[PDB]
Structures are given as structure tokens and as C-alpha cells.
Design a protein around this nucleic acid. Structure first.
Lengths: 214, 219, 124, 48
RNA sequence: GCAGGUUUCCACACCAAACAGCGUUGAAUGUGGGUCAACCGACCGUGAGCCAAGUGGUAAGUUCACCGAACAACCAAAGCUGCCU
RNA sequence: GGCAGCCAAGGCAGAGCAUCGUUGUGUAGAAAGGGCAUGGACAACAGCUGAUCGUGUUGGGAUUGAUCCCGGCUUGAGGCGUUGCCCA
RNA sequence: GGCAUAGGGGUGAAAGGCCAAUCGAGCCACCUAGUAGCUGGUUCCCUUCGAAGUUUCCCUCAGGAUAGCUGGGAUCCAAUGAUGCAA
RNA sequence: ACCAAGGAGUCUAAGGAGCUUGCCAGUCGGAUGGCUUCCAAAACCUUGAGGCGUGGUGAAGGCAACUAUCCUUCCAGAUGGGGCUAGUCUCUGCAUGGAACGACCGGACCCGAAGUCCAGUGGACAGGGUUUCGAGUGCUUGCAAGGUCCUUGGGACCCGAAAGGUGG
RNA sequence: CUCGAUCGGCUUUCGUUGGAAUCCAGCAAACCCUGUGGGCUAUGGAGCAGUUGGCUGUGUCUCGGUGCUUCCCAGUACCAAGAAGAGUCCUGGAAUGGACCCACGAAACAGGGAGACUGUCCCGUAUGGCUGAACCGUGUGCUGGGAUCACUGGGAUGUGGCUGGCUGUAUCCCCGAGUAGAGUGGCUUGGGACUGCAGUUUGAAGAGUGACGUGUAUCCGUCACAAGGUGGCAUACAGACCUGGGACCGAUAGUGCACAAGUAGAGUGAUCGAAGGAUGCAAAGAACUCCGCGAAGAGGGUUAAAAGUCCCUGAAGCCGCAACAGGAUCGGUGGUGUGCAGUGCUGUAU
RNA sequence: GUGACCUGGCGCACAUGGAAUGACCCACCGAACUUAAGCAUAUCACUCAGUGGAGGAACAGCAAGCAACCUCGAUUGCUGCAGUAAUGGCGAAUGAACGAGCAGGACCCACGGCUCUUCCUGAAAAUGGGCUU
RNA sequence: ACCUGUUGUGGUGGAUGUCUUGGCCCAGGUUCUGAGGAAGGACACAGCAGCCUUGCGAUACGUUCGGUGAUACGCAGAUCUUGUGAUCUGGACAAAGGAACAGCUUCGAACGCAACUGGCCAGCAAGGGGUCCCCCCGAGCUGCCUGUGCGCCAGUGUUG
């Protein structure tokens, strides 16, 4: 937004474009250049950059399958950093009566009785204001990730488990890999309900077990 | 230009397509696709709620075969039924058909009896699945309507009928194994093809031949 | 899209806080009621007002008490009966105290104040 | 937008009122064909 | 006294803020004052020139054309005067 | 690179462990060779911080090196860091 | 003092003079971040490999394309020492 | 002259050659469609035309890859089998490279058009020969995504003309 | 003035409803016959003849419902928004920090403020309430039951009208001209013996015409009916206003402008166009004393701290001062190996 | 007897128009830098600049259309056709459309995708008009 | 003493770190100006005010009314409290009632004609004031193109 011209040679200055006019500090100053103050950056960011990424559906489904297998292997749940102290079994299955839960108090009662409220409490304690200029751009806090409750349908357990800090909610009808493997890291604690568990392989259309080398 | 073997560029970006400081650009970024999907869905269901006790699309469209030789076998939906299909179904008033929800297209005609019969039976399964509400709520009530079809008007999402393509995807279904016919044993299909193609090429020649024959007949 | 008015934007929220008018600063400068008042009226918090008693409950004047004598809504401050401070010279001035620190010990109970208490007290 | 705008600022504030109403809820006319008569005869009996 | 300046005019306070290539001073700074018209001038027209109008030109606005009571046009521009009323 | 004489070690299979052998210049250029470092997203460190963050300054130690860690002082938070990965 | 002549245009007893310290085509904004085979700069470390100024064609001779030299990725094979004794 | 802060191979469409991953004669399908306070414009779903690939060749008219137990041939060659022997024989023959084809598909020649046949306007192929061509086939080497180094159009690694134009 | 219709982001708009008081008219207001208005709208129509259906004020006497108000009886509702500023203690200027046993909310752990790091301090959030607008409690409202009123469906039977389909006819139905096209010239297009457009000359058919991507002539076929017009939807939207967001920038960045920025300033003008954020928790903004003309300065204070209206921090470069170490020589900076002084660090046997 | 029309004028009354708007739109007008390693047709580009006019959208729009099919059936937008057919010192380069799949085919438009004029009818569509109420 | 150096300290300087009522970007909605005077430009207007204000217009940092409900504030000064009631806020802005709808200098499309003029002390004129006249002030009307209507006309245009 300037009418800057280059002064040329024969003048004892560099040959950068300079502000036309006079009578102010801005006059004569270099413009139109990454190297210049107030001048455009190098290769200004365009809005038609590729922001999204394309993954074939087969590969996304394979990612979901593998994230679930790693959730089933518990020497990775603890590796990712969950407390399996009070966890009786892995994978964690839960009676369908919790899908009719209405209170966060009953949700925490269930999570205590099963052994994931340790993770919830860890997340709640370690919740902090985000480090380094992320807190300025509407990302105020850095919250860790606790258990993942996978329900069979849209039910009340969503509002039940909603406020609990680390807990995320999901459904077998649409299993989100951003929740099954957050950060790209694998082995997250999942607390499937009984019908969700029974429908896992039906939804994911898994017919056999794979013969994997040992 | 490459110092290699890469193809000839053929790039086609010589005309200020780029939104720089001097140019407005020729770029349209479709970042609205995500939000517009939901907005289209919302306005579609608002259309349904507006014209509620009726199909959400609303007019019965005919089924016509796609146009060219490449898409002959594929069927699809038309714009409206021909007045011959209407008269065959039992409707002789295009405006009444339209008011009860059958779409009309006087531009279209039936170039064959198959389309006529297909869309006629389409309209006839319509007008039987159809529950007309009576005007002024308490006068005459048509046949079939049982006084609780009016109590329970249900808006179906798709129009009862199968998919449009499921009408060519049924004509494209072979028969059971069969015996050959002696004409199917004697017939040479490649010879027939070559014959009917040489036919269109030997026309003026098959006139000059007759002319020579009759000249020699004179002589 | 999130619906209008219920936005957790830091910049917008802070803009609103720092450009609020006096009728909005009246409710931003609300204070908590004592347990006596809270049980009596079944109301938990009210906007602070001149002429009512508070206990400071926070800051370098915690545990002190007195009647509010000035709501300086421009500064979000509240001046109290006898929380004063001498200047360089002997002139005694008032210390502003954000009303979130204080709890409310008494009310003045004007007509609109009693009506507000009743309307917020009827449980729903 | 560089001067008083001593009429366009008012029409724009009116437009803003309308816009921040329609953002809350789509408009609903108070009197329409189905309630004119009822409102009018209610008014008549009440004032008579 | 013109053009230009636009309060620099005057008085008081003030120079330990700074300016005046000093500083009890100033066209500085701060405060407060001051410019009176039938007779001096703009205003009245007219000159060179211009605008609208009238008409024309242009894809179209125009810093498009014409200013023609020496001098135009494609033009129905005398709206005023005397008596009766 | 566990099906090993035993301990110690190693124990991430393009890693590691043991022995032996060869070879070390380099402009332009290169490395699907290896790393240091900066802003931020997604995750982990139940990481640190008013018993004083970060910046900076001055000494010390580590490193072939990019650089890293610490003590003192300033300073006082309108905080910061380590690891994996991703976007620059 | 007023008014008139404006940029490829004005005006000039002509110097290509003069048209706001600007003139063999004023200035101002934009096209425009014009193009440049040309000049200058091109930001951390270590390890390893490592050139060419020659061929042909080119309105070509300060440049290119093309072989050559230079790096990397490989594929099919080949080749590839080492038990102190005692048990 | 000095110090500080800024400062130059970037993004995009198409493409090339490696590498990674998934599927396979298929693959992809986020144009669009179904769902569900914010998150979510996400995630999930196969309604999907179609893109690329499965066939090439001819200017075109057009035509279209032989082989009935299996198998194109030859040279080198990875494995493996059966005998045998520290001499050492047979069978298998992948990949790759070269050659060939009495092979075949399409085009171009020459001698012919004999011979068989019929959806019969006399038309359809057919035979034998060639110093013949193809970006041909001979048990389909495909699709998609990501990543690296690059190419061309774009400001195009950063800065840099004297100029040209439009309007004032 | 009534009467009707229409409108509500509203306060109207229209009407051959009728009436009164009046004025023009006088073969009869004024435009208009150089045509206002009706019928049809080419997969059809009009006329005529006949049939089969439906919409409508219906005159008239039947029956039920919904409700505008009012009255009774009975029940319900009238809007906000949870949870320790817990008993204490410690650090701190100030607890949201830390310690002790016990506490709680969450449909609310989105945010923002507050004397520091909060789910339980404040606003809010989730949820709820409204959206007949009333968001109100000796006043109402809603529902249900009952009653009066207000209003509209089902049957009489003259209508006033209409109007769809079907059959038959002997009757017939006229489609946009300086236009389309052509010669030529020029622009345009992928459109190529010319895609479209425009000037000019020329200029049709309508017993047809246009297009069918090689100019022409001859036959045939398919589709459509130009030279008049309306016409919503899916569509675009860098401004400006109302919103929600962000892997964006973070004061030499991001808009030229985070601020009294299109401002100060420059140019006769067209135009050009900056620099410029942060005291503190709270002004508590430095009382009083000595000295001086005074500013300062020396004390003495505020405060956690001067953080002192130049105010978060305060780098490098450069400079003053003190201490110490040296000082002729590119005999240099730097490197090397010692040394000598000063100065740390690490380890350290009996 | 001093008119009736036609065609022009002047004044008055009641009204439209005018001007503005860093996005989008409609009609015109209209470059050159650039690229072609020069340059002139070509390219940038039927773009920038310039003129005029808007609306919440504008423009287009129910065929004197596509096609050659087993036809379709307003226009518009997207996917794709397709970097193809074709144009081009056949150089640099440029470059569609239909088929087909969608959104739309509710709504503040409609004679529910048409209608004016032609054509048929026809005593202007019938108890004068105006100002106040 | 001067120079060179190294520390400590003090200045000059404003780099760094942290933040931000700001920008930029994407998505959604609207586009709502004007001859009834727009957008812009002037001159005014505050007890102490210069600037700024999408403040305002001689009713001049504001008037009526509604929502709220005790402030506003840099000083002072009288109004204001279970209330016609401080302040803030709402397009002069809600009332569902055709109830209610104030005012707005001046140039500007800019409108009587001009204008580098507050000129012509314009024409007409309701009214107000000083004394039938006369004098001063003076609301309001007078712009063009186009459309319709009304009034007056013009024509060796056609006719009677």
C-alpha cells in the first residue's frame, strides 16, 4: 500500500524501492521487501494452501483397528501413561446400565469402581494454563487425556461423563482415531460398554483374526 | 527446458490467476463446503417442514433412458410425465395432476411403448399409494382413504419406488441357460456387421452398377 | 457454528469487561452474601450497593468490616466505612476494594431491592 | 465512515437491532391474517 | 497600504522547560484584551474570459462543442410598460 | 542380537554387543548419512514456578561442533521447560 | 492584477530552450513485486563422496539445451581368516 | 565505521523418478447424499456418476492379439527336486539382459483373391510371399494416499533497470 | 361518514359497498375506438350439439364443535442458574500456593475478572424459563369441568354464479420485417470456405422457417418455432454492519493506524503520509527538614519494591569513575608451548 | 356560428430521476509491461485503467435447445467431460460443449414453468364523474 | 597525566522475555442511503475543553419516552434515594392501540439567481414588532429533466 520507487544509482544509497514524497520520516525509507521494515514478507501466505489431507478409507479403518488392538494390549496403556493399579482387566467392559447415567457424580462413582478415576484425577490435577502463546489464541488450558468411554448409541451417559476433565465420549458407530490414538500415540484406556463391545467387530466388519508372525 | 525426460509442461497459468497485490485473482477456495453441507441439510428439512405432509421432493418424476449410445441402458428420472402417460394412467387434466403431485412435461413424448407402459404403471402405483386430503376438512372423502390416513399423515423420505437406475439394472439381467436356435447356429454375426457397414459405403457404386447393367442391356 | 452471545473468546470477553457501561458494571461488581442473609433470603449473590455492610474477607484488610460508602464503578472499586489511608500529607483517602473480596453483611432494602430479593428468592 | 454519518449511522444501528434480533430467532409478525379479527374484536369488546 | 502571513498587534506575568547560531530582552511561553463606516473598499455592472440555457456531439459522464447586441443557431426565451378594471 | 557354561554388560534387529581389517585433503555439488537449534498444534512428563518464571549479566562445567546444564546477581510471572510427532 | 494555451501536448526573435530547484517528452496514482541470458546477497554443526572450463546444435560467442565428469538410490549375482590346552 | 532487531529456494496446478502404506483386475471417489450446546467446517458411512487401469494399432474408413491335456523358443541365470559323490549327472528355470518367432493383433507393400461361407443390393473373410512399421501381445504390474529431490506456469530464492501503458 | 377487502420489522393500502353536503355534465365526466377490456395460449383451442364431475354468497328450518369476553368450582405456574473464600496453620504486600484429618458440585472443568498458580470469590457457563410477549405474585395466567355470549362444519332447495373431463361435427385457427439471411469491412471465438456481434449495401419466406460444427447443388429425416415479455430456487459477495471461530501476528510483527491515524507533516495540486503499547494491589503520585534564586541535591518518607507520571524488564554498542595489570617497535589481533601474578573449580591416602 | 380535432407551447399541481457506496453484478470501452529467450499475427486479455446502471443479489431462464440415442426436456452453480475436439509464425501457447452425476425443482415469483401481440369477442366492459365527510 | 585491558559501578540506549480493548484469516447472515435532502465538507455547541467521539445542531457532549435502578467523577455545584428516580442503556428507540412518532445551523445530488460575495440590500408572502400609510424582522413558495392532470394559448395542419 505504497507508491514506492527506486532512487536508482548515482545516489549514495542502496537500490531498494523507497517511499516517494517528503516532509515525514517515512519518506525515502525502503519499501517493498522482506528485508525492509513495513514491507511485505517473503512469499506471503496464501489462503489456497493445502490445509486438509486425504487418507483412503481402507487405511483409516486399519488405523482404527490397530488403535483398538493397542488399547487391548495393556503394556501400552501404561506406557502411554495410564494407571493400571486398580484396573481389573484390559479391555475394560462395562454394563449397559451406565448408558442411562444422568449425573457426573454417578459417572465418577462408576469410574472409581472400575479404576479409571485415577486417570481422571491425574488429568484434573495436571490441568494447567497452556505454555507459550497458545493461551492467547483461545486455547487457554493444556489438559491431558484420560479414559475414553465408547457407548453404543446417543444416550444420557454423554451428559453424565461430559464434565469429567480427561474423559472423552465416542460411539462404535463412528470411532474417532483422534480419540483412539491422541497425539499419534497408541495404547489409550477405553472403557467400552457391553453392547458397544459386542458391536465392535460387527461395525468394523472384522471377520477373522490375523495370522501374525512371532 | 528440464535437462531430463519430463513431459512438455502445458501449464496454463499465464493470465493473472494469482491474488497478489496488483491483481484480484481468479481463485475460488471452497472452504464453505463443510458448513454448506449442514446448511443445505437444514434448509432441506425446513422445506420438508414447510411442505410437510407431502414428499420432500414432491413431484413424481418419470423414468427415462439416459441419452447417448454410451448411456442407453442407464435409466434415470425425467422432468415430468407425458400427457399420453397421464391419459393412459387415467388423468386427462395436466393441471389437476400437478396439483395432486404428479409432474407433467408436455415437451416429452413417448417414442416407444415401453416408456409409456413403465411410466403409466408408475403413475398407477402412485394415485394408489396417494392419500388425498379433502378440501375444507369434512366434505367428501375419496376411496381407499380410511379417515385415519388423514389422522396419520406420514412424510416418507424417498418415494416408495426403487432407485431410478434399478429399471435398467433389471433389463440388464441375462436369462437362464437355454438351447441354441438353428439361426443362432448358422448366423455369422461378424459377417453381418461387416455387411451392414459396407452397405452404407456402397450406395453410389450400387447405382453406377445398375446404370452400367442397363446400358449393356440396351446394347 | 456456535450460537450468538455464548462465546468464550478471550479478546471479546476482555473487551466487554473493560468497556462495560455503569449498568453492566453494577452487576460485574456483585458481592457474595453472608450465610445469615443467604439462608434468610435464599439468594446467594447480589450487586453491591452504597449504604450496606461488608466484611472484606480478602486482601490486606481481610477480617475488617464496614458500610459501603462509594461504588467507584469506573475503577471497579468499593469504598468502605472506615478503611482509610493517609496521603503524604494528613489527608485521609479511601482504598478501593474489588467487591469479589468482600461478602455482604447487611442490605439497605429499598423497594426495588426488596423486590429483587423476592424475585431471586422464589426458587423458580 | 469518515464523517458524522448523521443519518446512515442511525439507519445502520436500526439494521443492527434487526440483525441481532434475527440472529436470536427468525421474525414472527405480531398481527397476521389469522389473528387480525380476533385482536380487533377483543379490542372492541374491551373498549366498549 | 497589495499579494502572502493570520493574532505575529497591546498589556501583564515570565526566560531556569525549550527557541532566539546572550537571555531582568523578544515575533518565545502563559494569561487577558483589542479591529466600530451611508462618506475607505468588496458588493453594482462591464472588459479580456467563463458558466448555465438553448441546441448538438459521444458507447457514455466529462475539465464534451458553441457564448455569437461587431459576430451563431436547428431558436415559440419580448412575463414588462400606459390606460381601462 | 537368548534356542547361550555362570555372573557383569548388552538386550531400540539400519539399533546394540565382541573381535578384526581398511580408509581419513577438498572448491562447485551431493548424501533415502547423523545431529544442534526457533515459533506453534496434537500427545506424554500427576514436569517446574511467589520457598521466585522468563529475560538479561557474570563465573563454572559438558561438547569435535552446532550447542547444553548449573551457581551468583538483576528480575518477578500479563510464567516456563523436557520427550514423541505434526504444521512452518 | 485578471484571463487563455497541458504532456507526444503547450510555448518559443529557436537555446530541443521553457511548462513549480523536474524536460530530447513534466509530475502524480495505478498496471507493477514490469522483465533482466546481467551485478550483489543468499542465515546451523559434524561425517562421507566429489568435479568441469571439453563434444554437438542454437540470432549462438557473459547464455542455453546435449553428451562427458560429479552425487545418490538401487536390481542380479559374486566375494568375504581367526577353538591355548584339558574335559 | 559500530551494535541491536528484520532480512532471501516459499505456496499452488500439472508432471517426472525413487521410497512408504493400503487394496487388487481393480482402485479411488470428502461433486453430492445419511447422521449429531460448543468441540464438530471433525469423525463415521458405499448414493456415487466418473478418473486412472484392464488393448493396441491405422490419417481414416476401421479393425482388434495363434495355440483343445499343459507349455512360445534359445543363451546366461535365482531357488528347489531326484540320483550321486568331497570326480560329481539329470530335472526345475523365477527376475534380468540379449536374440528369435515356423507365433499372433493393427497399419504399409507384392503375387493373388484361388477357397469356404451367408441376416445375399454380391458381399464377409480366406492363401502365399516382404530387407516392413507400432508408444503392440505372448499368463494384463494397476489404483489411491503420503513423503523426498526436482520441472514448467505462476512475483517464484531476495533486491535491482533505462523503459511501455491507463487515468488524472 | 360508514361497509368490505388487504397490512403488521405495524400505525396502512385498495375498493363501481352504501349515505349525506356539494360542484362539473347535460345526450351526458375525462382519457380511449390510431382500442381499454375479456376468450385461447399449439402434445391444442374456439364455435356448435350432447353428456359426465366438482368449487361458491347460498333464501329457508335442522345438529354439533371451536372459541372473543365474562362468571363459578378445582388444581398447577409466574426464573433463575450448584458446589469450602471450610476449622486451622505457614509463606507472602496480597493466597488461587503449601501442610493437617475431614468437605462438597458437575446437564455447569466454555470463558473472563478479581492483590499470584481456583470447579466450589464475582459475572457467567450447562440446564431452565420465555418468545399469545407478562416476565409479574393481596396481581395474574394456564388447564380441566360447567354456563352465557363471540364464531363455522354437517342436512332443505330457488338460486346467483361458475368451472374440469369425455363424445361428435360440417365449421376454422391468420405465430412478431429493415427482421432473419447474404455481399463486404472490422472486432470476437476452440468454433476451423468465417462461433457470435457491429457498420453499411442488400434484404426474404410465412403453400413455411431456423438448426443439425467443410463451402455448393439435389433428395430425405430429426428437433425446435427467432426477430415481444414475466419469471422464484439452487449461485456470487475482499466493502460496510451483526455474529461464530483460528495449528495466524504479537508492537521493526499484524491493516498505513493496538494510541487524539488517513492524524502530525510534506506538496500549488493530483496525491504522499509517519513515529507513537505496559507505574503500582491500591495514587498510596513523594509530607516535613537543610541548602540554594530556583530546578535540583542531602536527608526523611509511600510501597513488597521506587516501580517516581522519562514510570514491567532493561541487552549490545558507546561513555564516566574507582581498583588492579601492562604500556617504543605488524616485535600486532589470533594461534602454540611454558612461565609469572591474580582468580576460581574438581578430587583428595594414613 | 365563432367551433371540432390534430399537432406544439407556457404556467400551475401532484410525482419519478439526479448523488453516494475498498465485496459481488449488468452493459460498454479498453491497454501495455510480460511471454514468444529477438519481434510484428499470437500472449498477457476479450484482463488493468476509463464510462454508465443497479439489486440483495444481479444476469440467465420453460427451447426457432441437446442429440442421432432404448433420446432428452428452463436456466444457474458444482463434479466431470478436459488440457480432450479445435484454434495457433499449427511456434509460444490457447481451448470449449453435450452426454452423464448432483444441488435446485417448498417459500416472500408463476396463468404452480408461462404469457403479451397476432387470432376470436367486443356499445370501454356499464345506473356519470369530482371535492369533503 | 595519556593509552590499552579486566572487573565493579554509574550513565546513554531501548534489544529481549511476557502480555494485548489491535490486526489478519475462514464460515454464516444482512446490505437496511437520498429531493421527506444522502455520503462528505464547514461553522458552531461543555462551569473549568484544546484534540478525539458512527458526540451533537441555536432544544447544539444533548430533549420526550421506555428498560434498569443509586450513581457520575479530573475538580468543584445543586439535583437525586422503599423513588417521577441518580446513572447507564435502548434508531427519537418498546407499547399492537392506524395509540405514539420531537428537533435537526450551513455547503453539498443541492434546488429562486449567484457565490473566492453569507451578494442580488431577489420577487411573492403568513405572521411578529415600531408607529391607514410607512419602518424593521420575517416562516413559507419560486431548480431542472420526465410523467399525468388542470388553466391559458399557437398554427395560410385537417375540418365546420
Amino acid at each position: 500500500k505504497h507508491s514506492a520507487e527506486s532512487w536508482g544509482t548515482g545516489r549514495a544509497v542502496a537500490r531498494i524501492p523507497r517511499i516517494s514524497g517528503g516532509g515525514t520520516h517515512r519518506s525515502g525509507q525502503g519499501a517493498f521487501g522482506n528485508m525492509c521494515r513495513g514491507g511485505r514478507m517473503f512469499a506471503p501466505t496464501k489462503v489456497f494452501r493445502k490445509w486438509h489431507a486425504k487418507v483412503p478409507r481402507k487405511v483409516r479403518r486399519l488405523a482404527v483397528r490397530a488403535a483398538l488392538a493397542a488399547s487391548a494390549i495393556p503394556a501400552l496403556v501404561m506406557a502411554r501413561g495410564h494407571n493400571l493399579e486398580d484396573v481389573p482387566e484390559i479391555p475394560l467392559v462395562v454394563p449397559n446400565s451406565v448408558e442411562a447415567l444422568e449425573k457426573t457424580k454417578d459417572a465418577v462413582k462408576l469410574l472409581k469402581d472400575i479404576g479409571a478415576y485415577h486417570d481422571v484425577e491425574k488429568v484434573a490435577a495436571t490441568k494447567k494454563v497452556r505454555v507459550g502463546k497458545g493461551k492467547r489464541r483461545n486455547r487457554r488450558y493444556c489438559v491431558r487425556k484420560g479414559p475414553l468411554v465408547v457407548l453404543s448409541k446417543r444416550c444420557e451417559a454423554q451428559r453424565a461423563f461430559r464434565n469429567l476433565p480427561g474423559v472423552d465420549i465416542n460411539f462404535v458407530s463412528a470411532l474417532n482415531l483422534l480419540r483412539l490414538a491422541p497425539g499419534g500415540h497408541i495404547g489409550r484406556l477405553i472403557v467400552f460398554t457391553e453392547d458397544a463391545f459386542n458391536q465392535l467387530d460387527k461395525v468394523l466388519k472384522v471377520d477373522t483374526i490375523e495370522g501374525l508372525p512371532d | 527446458v528440464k535437462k531430463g525426460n519430463a513431459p512438455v509442461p502445458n501449464a496454463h497459468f499465464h493470465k493473472h490467476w494469482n491474488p497478489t497485490g496488483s491483481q484480484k485473482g481468479h481463485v475460488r477456495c471452497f472452504f464453505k463446503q463443510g458448513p454448506q453441507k449442514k446448511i443445505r441439510r437444514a434448509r432441506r428439512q425446513k422445506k420438508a417442514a414447510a411442505v410437510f405432509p407431502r414428499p420432500v421432493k414432491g413431484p413424481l418424476r418419470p423414468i427415462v433412458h439416459c441419452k447417448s449410445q454410451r448411456f442407453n441402458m442407464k435409466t434415470r428420472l425425467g422432468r415430468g410425465f407425458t400427457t399420453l402417460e397421464l391419459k393412459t394412467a387415467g388423468l386427462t387434466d395436466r393441471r389437476y395432476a400437478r396439483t395432486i403431485g404428479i409432474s407433467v412435461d408436455r415437451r416429452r413424448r413417448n417414442h416407444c411403448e415401453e416408456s409409456l407402459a413403465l411410466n403409466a404403471e408408475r403413475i398407477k402405483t402412485y394415485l394408489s399409494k396417494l392419500v388425498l386430503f379433502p378440501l375444507k376438512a369434512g366434505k367428501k372423502l375419496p376411496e381407499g382413504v380410511t379417515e385415519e390416513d388423514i389422522k396419520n399423515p406420514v412424510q416418507s423420505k424417498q418415494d416408495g419406488f426403487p432407485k431410478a437406475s434399478s429399471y435398467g439394472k433389471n433389463a440388464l439381467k441375462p436369462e437362464a441357460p437355454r438351447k441354441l436356435t438353428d439361426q443362432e447356429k448358422k448366423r455369422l454375426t461378424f459377417q453381418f456387421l461387416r455387411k451392414v457397414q459396407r452397405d452404407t459405403k456402397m450406395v453410389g457404386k450400387r447405382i453406377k452398377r445398375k446404370a452400367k447393367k442397363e446400358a449393356k442391356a440396351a446394347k | 457454528v456456535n450460537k450468538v452471545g455464548k462465546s468464550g473468546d478471550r479478546r471479546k470477553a476482555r473487551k466487554s469487561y473493560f468497556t462495560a457501561p455503569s449498568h453492566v458494571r453494577r452487576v460485574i461488581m456483585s458481592a457474595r452474601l453472608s450465610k445469615d442473609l443467604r439462608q434468610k433470603y435464599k439468594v446467594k449473590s447480589l450487586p453491591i450497593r452504597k449504604e450496606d455492610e461488608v466484611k472484606v474477607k480478602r486482601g490486606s484488610h481481610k477480617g475488617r468490616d464496614g458500610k459501603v460508602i462509594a461504588c467507584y464503578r469506573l475503577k471497579y472499586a468499593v469504598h468502605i466505612d472506615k478503611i482509610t489511608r493517609e496521603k503524604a500529607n494528613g489527608q485521609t483517602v479511601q482504598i478501593g476494594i474489588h467487591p469479589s473480596n468482600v461478602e455482604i453483611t447487611k442490605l439497605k432494602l429499598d423497594k426495588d431491592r426488596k423486590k429483587l430479593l423476592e424475585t431471586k428468592g422464589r426458587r423458580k | 465512515g469518515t464523517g458524522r454519518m448523521r443519518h446512515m449511522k442511525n439507519v445502520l444501528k436500526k439494521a443492527a437491532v434487526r440483525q441481532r434480533q434475527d440472529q436470536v430467532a427468525p421474525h414472527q409478525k405480531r398481527k397476521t391474517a389469522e389473528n387480525r379479527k380476533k385482536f380487533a374484536l377483543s379490542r372492541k369488546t374491551k373498549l366498549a
